[PDB]
């Protein structure tokens, strides 16, 4: 449900943090926190600052 693509790259420091690649599409399932969100790129799961990712939302 819902989809958003990050505009820039992200560098995680902890294992609980994932690496958000610029231009990569990540499917959001549920927001753990207001600042920390969850997502799934290919076959990996992790969390990262919601301030990064960029919501797309398109009709077509």
Q: How far is CA 36 from CA 11, 32, 47, 54, 58, in A?
A: 14, 6, 6, 14, 24
30: domain CATH number?
Answer: 2.30.30.40
Structure tokens at 20: 């958000």
Number of structural domains found in the chain:
1
CA 12 to CA 59: how far, in whole Å? 32
| Closest-CA residue to 32 (of 42, 18, 21, 22) | 18
Q: How far is CA 44 from CA 12, 39, 52, 58, in A?
A: 14, 9, 18, 25
Question: Which domain, by its residues, includes 11?
Answer: 1-60
């Amino acid at each position: 449900m819902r989809q958003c693509k990050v505009l820039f790259e992200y560098i995680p420091q902890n294992e609980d943090e994932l690496e958000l690649k610029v231009g990569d599409i990540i499917d959001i399932n549920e927001e753990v926190e207001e600042g920390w969100w969850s997502g799934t790129l290919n076959n990996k799961l992790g969390l990262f600052p919601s301030n990064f990712v960029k919501e797309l939302e398109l009709e077509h």
